């Protein structure tokens, strides 16, 4: 009959989230309890009731006694894992207690940036058993798994945490146990509000303020400068995300500004051409409509973006 | 007679592709099966039918029994390889099973950027045997080799995967076995369409829109600004590729814009000089041709680029 | 009865403080004294009164004698720790002396940027015992703990240093000892004064100097350029801090400049519109008020910022 | 009498050349053959005629037999060297065969940038014996040393490869053997032609095109803008090279453009001052000379640079 | 009585100097000679007169014989040290010879940037003995210490090198030996002359050239542009140094230019205001003084900077 293995995992720190590379790094602790009757012993007088071992000596003892150990792996681990503590404790009845402290990076293949920056994401860590379920079975340790209090993350806010068990067939035809830890997070909007939304609205407001001078050439020149400013803003924004194959809300928002600036340039050019041919009265008649059509275009664009994306 | 060695390799993650340095990094697993009759044993009562070893103990046992092992290497490996699991399993008949999990970077010397960004590339991993074929022979393990489902790559799309066997003579006069895994990939165009093509066309469209004002000096000034804008665009684009010895489609596309801007400047200067000498009627007569010659030049340039490159 | 463990920690160098990632790196030394009567020995003639061991041999000796050692860990350690010296000295009465030299990075979750750049911060290092207090108890070594003289930090100035003891329940239901070292630091203002405050004031002063020309259009153009300059300054400043969820004094200072520039643009546009309709006398009458209202707005904004934040 | 040591070294990949730091990184293989009669043995029946060892076991065997080994070092190695394979093979007559695969970075102190970008450089790798020549002597292995075919370098082209032997006195009064591998390389000019030469010539051509409008103020403004453009180009160029103590051809080329722009500004200012005083006829008379003196200055500057540097 | 330990240290390469982080990295070699009569032996026939050991075997032998070894450390070492060779040689009389090759980074807390870029700096490496002087004493090995010939540094020039001995009390109440190696270096000025001094002087010269047009508004506009250019130059310069708490010569030089530009703007505004009120004769009378006061201000500023700093 297969033997039971109890698994527990806790996350202490979140050292960083890299959305450009779609990965994250944490500092955590692992606890495992496993009982093997063949490791039972009787303590001599003057000796402690529990024995302490290093990992190498414990492995050598297991090899000498020819006992199979439950090898496992981190399925979505990336790069090198730095170990701080690896301790072994053995009781008289054969129960083995193991502790592991580490820092490592893990893959996050569930990213979706369609609703950026109003998006919510999922992160997980998978622990897989190598041997099939007819030799070892995973069980959930009680009272240890979860997330810490001083995570240190400034931008992301955790919403929920869950754990469960499942199976896999990575290396054997038969099923093997898998342990899963998951959590969800969302984003703060203060940085985006302070750095992106306000400057664009201020530039648009000043450009519309300048329209009361009734200077078509000056309007054309200002719109031409604002087009380059918007292009620079788009190029700056594009550097924070991977080269995705789909269009996002921010990109649509910038393209709308591009289109509106182009339309304003065309209208001002037409008004100047009308003025140049002695139709100043017609230009003055159409100027009120030209001025009043400016904010409604942006309002309609915002409404259209909301309808399309939400 | 030589002994048979079965080889299998699977790729789980693609952590990144660096076209500037022409290399890529993956996370994969290696499986090898090899049978040696001299390692046969009989299990004692109460002991498992299979024995588990660490790598060092297995190597020490092989050295004590004086048995040659099939050493191999990754031919195109670059840098340090980080190992996560290295496990050994031995059966009673002498069959050895080996598992290896790693993360590493590999060279990609087959890059070709002539059709960038409409290019398709090839990637491969080579496994080479050190000893000649009269001692060991490689064989293909069935049902293990291939690529995973959750690769995590956002820009590249895999098209096909193949494996085969060949030979090499790196260290011996005689032939030695080689195992090859290959795949092809292409590129998404959404990022390029959103970031490069649209702004240039919009700038050209606005510059041609401004031509209806009939202001030669303003046309000259706008063209002069657009030349600097195009130079900045070219400098920004050049940073994503190595310093190649051949010209690409994007570079030709930018040079065409340079040439067209220069021609527009020359034409506007000639028109202004004609106007300054009392030939305003001649300038107005030629203005229609000057305006109508603008988009045909770009159309002819696009056609010429298509003819030259495709 | 539990045995006493004496702990001492000293910091020699501060190699860097990364406020963007909220961590710091140091070079330090650790000293521990622990007495075990079971390790007593008698020296043979011709041999020294003290014995020197490497860490591995000492651990092997402890395992052979089956003696539990007081395992510990750095709670807020991040990444890999590089060890330079790990020495063991044993006396005849069983007293063990241990020395450890290392370089490592530690988490700083107590950062607060609300008063930046007039802020004061706290840094700490935690040492935790794994076994509960009924087996081992931590004690404070005298005359060793503190900070060095040649720290090498150029921007931060240390104000005070303290040490104390506390408890934790990370791995056991019972309490376990904890050792804490803390210090506070503040910031130099010369860099900020030379790089930020002076250029903005100079630009504002030159913009107000230009007001005596009585040219509304030139004022509008200069204000439009200064708005872009201020936007560039804000974008440059934002890169030195994490994407915080709250507003800081520098951000408020930049937003005030944005608002004042917008108001100046609006006022100049209104004056130009008044002049265009034959109300030049009214514009000249209001010009004195328009000129005199410029510095009072900045003075009131500075006063309001001081009231809000201090 | 000293024993002979045969040395061979081959380079498989060139992973990068860093001219800013003056170093390069490669992937290579090392082969050594050495015969020691004290290691002779007789094979038992059923055992192979050659024995395979790991490095640690071979070193332990040598220490047990008390045999000195020929220690060596890479003289110009920088940083850590990553080893992939380290294999030992021993024959019955005592001949030892060694293989080593590595990736590492090496110093390049022979750089000279005076003729940049028309320069040719030298690279080398030095292998030094620690013990003097009265104990060991190096010999050249035949048929192994050289460079591979798939180097992967895109910018540099190899011209020749050579090997030889010499001596050194790094650690002993007597001479010790040294093995040297050298090669030369030159640079591709397509990148420089496409990115540097064409834009500058186009800007100069457009600036000279604008001279036919007969507008001194516009000429002054255009020259003032081009001066800033050239300054930006110089600052961009300077980042690709170390802070050298001597002047290069590119720097002289940029300084010539600076000087010519300054002279053009001075001439245009003088012409405008002449026009302002009623000397428009004199200004028109001198305008032909002013226009015709523009390209001859650049031609003379190019000739002078060629004379000075070549 | 204490035993004598001979120490020698040589530096082969200088791989880089980081003034922003105030550290430097080198490649060097260490040689130590120490005699212990308890390690004497007699060679058997057929064996060499000297024995070769690895570090681990030598340490195990010392532990078996229970002999204290002179442990040492690099006091100002930062980060991980990469070892290439660690060799042990023992003679029949008990003399031990040790060799160590390494690459590492060291702290430089003696930096002073007040006279930048005309500054001269000091660098040192400290080797400290752990045990007090009543057990071991350091001595200076003759003919080994110093610096190499092919250092590879391009910007810094070494002026002198010295060695000496001193004491410390880092870990014991009694004194312990210390070995010190020091050298001084200065900076090349070609890079600064070519990149900083020339462009600023050229811009100032062109701005003063433009003054002969007698256009106050154009002077104001040019000065306004040059102010932004100088601000950009200051921001670019500030990135090469740490955020120091004191003002440097370059910063004072840039602030002087700021002040002079502001004064020029004020003077031009006053002249324009005088002209606008029918005082063109007064403006023309004061124009000669305004023109002649330009270079004397810069000359006086340079003299004042020289007086203040030198
Ligand atoms: C770190 N990875 C595991 C990802 C890579 C492999 O690491 P190694 O191959 O170096 O070591 C394997 C360690 C081990 F698995 F053998 C073991 F000792 F930890 C144990 F599992 F056997 C155990 F006994 F400790 C226990 F935890 F299962 C028990 F019994 F305590 F519950
Ligand atoms: C990681 N590289 C290989 C690139 C560098 C060298 O690595 P090492 O020299 O450290 O170890 C060599 C390991 C090994 F080759 F000896 C072996 F143990 F893995 C084995 F091949 F012999 C085997 F027995 F395991 C097996 F796989 F062939 C079998 F029999 F199971 F099929
Ligand atoms: C480096 N971390 C500790 C963070 C990770 C674990 O490191 P390791 O598990 O590799 O080694 C554990 C070392 C040790 F703890 F066993 C010990 F030898 F240092 C000792 F504590 F037992 C001691 F005896 F030295 C002493 F200091 F307590 C005494 F007695 F001298 F006071
Ligand atoms: C990697 N560096 C060498 C730069 C640093 C030192 O490396 P290590 O000190 O760790 O190992 C030393 C290895 C060695 F030198 F002892 C040896 F085993 F390789 C051998 F030279 F003795 C040999 F026997 F293999 C042989 F090659 F000379 C022969 F006989 F085969 F020809
Ligand atoms: C690298 N650091 C030293 C910075 C960290 C510690 O390194 P380790 O603790 O790993 O090794 C300690 C090495 C050593 F010190 F024991 C020794 F073997 F090198 C020796 F000093 F004893 C000696 F014998 F070699 C000798 F040099 F003194 C002599 F006798 F030859 F002169
Ligand atoms: C409140 C934050 C909004 C951000 C829109 C880009
Ligand atoms: C077409 C979308 C425009 C959005 C502007 C807020
Ligand atoms: C809740 C998000 C609304 C976004 C509107 C563009
Ligand atoms: C559809 C993508 C086209 C990109 C051309 C540069
Ligand atoms: C000469 C090529 C021009 C291409 C413009 C689209
Ligand atoms: C299919 C690619 C077409 C490119 C035309 C320039
Ligand atoms: C004295 C320094 C003040 C900095 C204000 C931003
Ligand atoms: C509203 C705050 C303005 C601050 C300007 C100094
Ligand atoms: C002491 C800090 C004052 C800040 C005023 C804005
Ligand atoms: C043909 C390349 C010339 C480069 C001159 C800078
Ligand atoms: C004085 C050198 C000028 C070179 C211009 C091509
Ligand atoms: C062959 C190089 C010529 C360079 C002329 C400036
Ligand atoms: C000769 C170099 C002078 C540098 C002044 C900044
Ligand atoms: C006040 C210092 C000015 C220096 C200009 C060279
Ligand atoms: C010798 C340095 C002189 C510097 C004058 C500003």
Short mmCIF file of C-alpha atoms in Angstrom, two decimals, chain B residues 19 62 87 115 123 234 308:
data_model
loop_
_atom_site.label_atom_id
_atom_site.label_comp_id
_atom_site.label_asym_id
_atom_site.label_seq_id
_atom_site.Cartn_x
_atom_site.Cartn_y
_atom_site.Cartn_z
CA UNK B 19 17.73 38.22 -31.51
CA UNK B 62 30.72 2.23 -11.72
CA UNK B 87 17.86 10.84 -10.45
CA UNK B 115 12.92 39.48 -44.75
CA UNK B 123 16.17 26.60 -33.88
CA UNK B 234 15.60 54.98 -37.92
CA UNK B 308 13.27 43.66 -55.02
#
